[model samples]
Target: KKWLGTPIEEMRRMPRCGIRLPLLRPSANHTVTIRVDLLRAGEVPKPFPTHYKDLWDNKHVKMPCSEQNLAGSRWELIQTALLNKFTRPQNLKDAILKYNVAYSKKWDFTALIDFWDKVLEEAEAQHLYQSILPDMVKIALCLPNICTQPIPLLAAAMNHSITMSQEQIASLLANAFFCTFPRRNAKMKSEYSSYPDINFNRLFEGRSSRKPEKLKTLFCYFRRVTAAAPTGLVTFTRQSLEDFPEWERCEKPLTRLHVTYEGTIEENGQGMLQVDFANRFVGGGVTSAGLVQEEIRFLINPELIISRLFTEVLDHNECLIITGTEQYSEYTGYAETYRWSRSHEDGSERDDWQRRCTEIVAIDALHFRRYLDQFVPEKMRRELNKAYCGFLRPGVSSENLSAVATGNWGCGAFGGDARLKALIQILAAAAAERDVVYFTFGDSELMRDIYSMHIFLTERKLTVGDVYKLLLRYYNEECRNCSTPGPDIKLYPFIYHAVES
Candidate 1:
């Protein structure tokens, strides 16, 4: 896949905050919380707090201090010790005061204090570190040049947080890979150097004319195989839009058509490799004599997706807007299962739908919008927008455009399961009043969601049937095994019933 060229400079301080609290209190209370914070250079570092192990007995023990434990007096001593250890003997307090003055003059000391305050408070309450440093580190690492620093102090302090965040990001990346099909013999590592690569075109396009609906069947089949993508590490090419089709669709048509793959496909090294094949087709039905070229763009920085997903699921933040699109189509259908039925011949009737309106151009109808919208904050949207405009879709327009702006229109397509659910919800709402929703089913969210589900299952070391079983088990079981203390004790049961039976 695409590699992030930008450096993560802010991550320089990550090592300083890497400390973990091994034990809570010195006595039998044993209840303690863990917290995290990102301290800028100017912030006043606090000392770690000391908790007495026992006051009633004649014995009292205090916790060790580190920069991370700045809220504690113990941490202050630890900081002093470190300064002594590093700078040594000569007026250490004076030196720190000098540094503090310089820091205060340059940065927001208030923010620093607030950050430390948050960490200590969080540590006392959640038994887990808050979302401050972990997320910041993830974001900073995704930026340019700044992430290359070697801060041993921070690393020693916040080692557990760093390791956990890295693992989470790695897992997310791996899942992304298995969901999307890669090129044949293409590397699946950081630079697409991994093995057993399959051709995206071949994996999806085996023959010309929907031979037994290969796209649908194959998507399900491969998802089962990739469901176990190790560590969720997947890779692809990130080329301009023009070069993408060449790698994906071998036979470049002479006619003008809209080539869209519904669902989200990040920019890879070569380009955004076509992942969702269910909606892979040529739109603008038969009009041109020459082929129009479009470039391929893929997501290289794994942090974008990783941080966004983590924020949504763990931090209760809005979901990240990976991408969005709008489309108009002449037809659409639905299915009760992954196995869709063809409308030709004696199976399903086409004319049973409606009459065609020739005057309708289906202009500017929102085909699909992935990533963030009202569901996410404008700050995130703006940040992602800058990223997409500056790098992903440079030279693209701001309005009235398809995934491929200067081309024909496709029926519909989407990337993730969330988009798929949104589409289903939209269709369900429209259908409630007998309103027809124009769409296509080949490359739909249902396909991609299944692909993602397969990846999750695979990563969990479960089989297709086993996945269904696990889902079903959770449905029938209680919230006993769930980490969250929620009343949705039968949440899995409801989901299992909806998908299984």
Candidate 2:
């Protein structure tokens, strides 16, 4: 509604509102510290259909990240670089001072113009755009001149640009999106937990930890052939049983048939007899019992073997089905299943009639055997690996865990050079645009929470509007019973205390 009165609420309901959330920035000077339950990372399954419901509801098991330091490196680096570039510093040296004063006093807006002139010259001299036209556009957008706007405004702009860039790189590097999570953390630890058994009330009763407040955006990749799609759309399709007719038995009389046409006996019963009665008479087949028996023996029921060529092919332009939108992974279980299935496959081609049937049976047998073999060993291995991996570290307290977890960075998802490089670049651009440095994936939830809180405070009246009355009632009750000060006192003193009670 033209960016009206209740912007936050209105924005929250907007179709693409979520893309703006990640770009949402915390206060420039404020160092937002978010304490994530590292114990929760492994407990949540990776993105797959099996984990979909649990992830959506946050009901999955969680174990603290074994090594928090193994986590947020890329985020931190990019964030730090971004912050240094965008935000004005309190500790500027002579060089920075000279540059700032020159621009503030002498050059005005043209300061950036001069800077870009140099950039263009360097680009032309080096012939940069020919090597990197679109990427250059991206870098230009992240330039200090463009990133100097307030956090919200900058975030909105960055969201659009970043999404496009992310898409481009993802296409160029398949499965690279998985590497977005940080791998190594600066702090390593042993144990973490997010028990689904505990009710929400029990979990947060006396605890200060509340759900991280932020808009969530969910992106899903899908293949189209599983379901019918509109024209020109490409999606993955396999030769599932749906493409072929099931074998059926027909009760029909067996008769001597001349070979008029070639067709599978499996497809059409031998009853389509093109008998040459004249030839039969000339050939003088004595209708003997043995002859009749021979004819009956030849009348074997024919069955059609499903054609291999009927299988569907996958293509890129298919419509992705957005099945869900919430914080958590959903692919791990599906990947695991696929992994298990592939493990059973012997090197037999589908068109290889002689080997196909035998291999299929063998695959089933192997599948069962694999399942039985994995139960105890896999569980033990996972636990042991998780333990040595840094499931528990930096003591029991959440704060200590948060600091220790900082060292955890890098993730399993992005192994290839291209994805990693692209991710680093994108994050660098984002950080530079926002004036942040040293963000971590392990602490993403924490950062997101802090950012959300900051935004809420900044736009309280514009966002929450007349909820103050009911909110105050709840606040007073919390303070009276729990001997705790209200969140308002800490969160929005300007509005909560300054406005008329």
Candidate 3:
């Protein structure tokens, strides 16, 4: 009530936005309408091809391996031809078991072979088998006895601005698919403590409600890549903010602030710096059953997963900027019900640096297990620095800067307060002299509250330091009020009284 500055009944009459509702019908037409609604709601909608065969036919794809037509003994001969390529001698069974470790004890070699045969049969039905098979074998053969060397290469790619060829990316991804990378299946987080676990072991091992959907995504990606490899180059850069502001000493007023509860950060904020509500290790449990914004982002733009190969564990004040990855798949659903719907084609322009104009900055939000844990100074400062690092554009002039696109940074599955997170982002944007467009993912109440608070602050011409001080006082007052019940004290009332005094 205090934050909104209006009676509760009056506030309720304000135009409510960003409400998401489930589809009333489950038919194909209803599904398409939902997809359209998702796009408008800031979601990356799945593509048009509802069936695998339709995708293959629509692309005019042919199988590369089938053209060679190596049959019976000839197939075995060709398989043996690539055996000596790896430092460790491994057979087909070893390769299969490498990816499907959980099934190793239960399923014999023949059963595994049958599974591969089934995969091939499905591919053959769509005429996609031959093109992917030989390449898959070659990729499997190229895996080093130790898969750890790519870490250095990934680092060099960022530091020295190295560009990877499409073929190199495909080969590396194929090895990842087979889970041949050495020492990547670490059970304890501390084992690969610095790097994200990039191997495909988990996806292959677990049987869950979402397994079929996951497989569809993987197979669709393989089909797309084997048909035609992407030719564009992408770059990953790690950025650290050099300057730190003493909030009390700083006095930058915000240029512009806009908040909305509709659309997604990437879709609505094109040509701007899009925020990735990321985990410290980068891809953040994508290999496991975890499905959320970051996981969905990685699934569609599979190349982004390559960052896991090299990115060191992130510090609170550090962020990663990834540019030029192509989107390869489309998906739908939220969390446990998420499904890979179809494929996608991202035709965004390339910049003068040979990178795609798409820029994604990965900054992690603080995870507060308890709600009160966020109110302390230490946690607040860390959150502020993380946002400032991502928002700051060192050499760019304020007039030339694009607005930030972000929302609910750590609120989902991370136990963060939405209102506090929104404020942190707004403060960071103000410090950097950039405008903000917030996506609430259908939270109308947050949208209204933030809009009102922003207007009140704007009217008062509050500086960053002023806001910071106000927040401190607000925190103290709220704590005091909690200790002894009397009247309800809120942020806006506290701020109003402070400004008046």
> Which candidate number has the best TM-score?
3
What ordering of candidates by TM-score runs from best to worst?
3, 1, 2
Candidate 1 per-residue lDDT, tens place, 327-431, comes to 111112222121223221111111101101000111111223642221222322222222222123223232211221111121234222233232222222111
- Per-prediction TM-score: 0.17, 0.15, 0.72
For model 3, residues 433-484, the per-residue Cα lDDT tens digits are 8777777777778888887778878888888887887776666667433644
Candidate 2 on 189-226: residue-level lDDT in tens? 22111100111111111211111000000011111111
TM-score of 2: 0.15
RMSD in Å for model 3: 13.7
Which residue runs does candidate 2 get wrong by more than 4 Å? 1-169, 172-466, 482-501
Q: Candidate 3: minimum summed lDDT over ten consecutive residues — where?
A: 10-19
What TM-score does model 1 achieve against the real structure? 0.17
**Candidate 2: worst 10 consecutive residues by lDDT?**
357-366
For model 1, the stretches where C-alpha displacement exceeds 4 angstroms are 1-66, 69-264, 267-300, 305-317, 322-501
Which is the better candidate, 2 or 3, if ranked by TM-score?
3
Q: CA lDDT, every prediction?
A: 0.22, 0.18, 0.60
For every candidate in turn, the CA RMSD to the true structure comes to 27.9, 35.6, 13.7
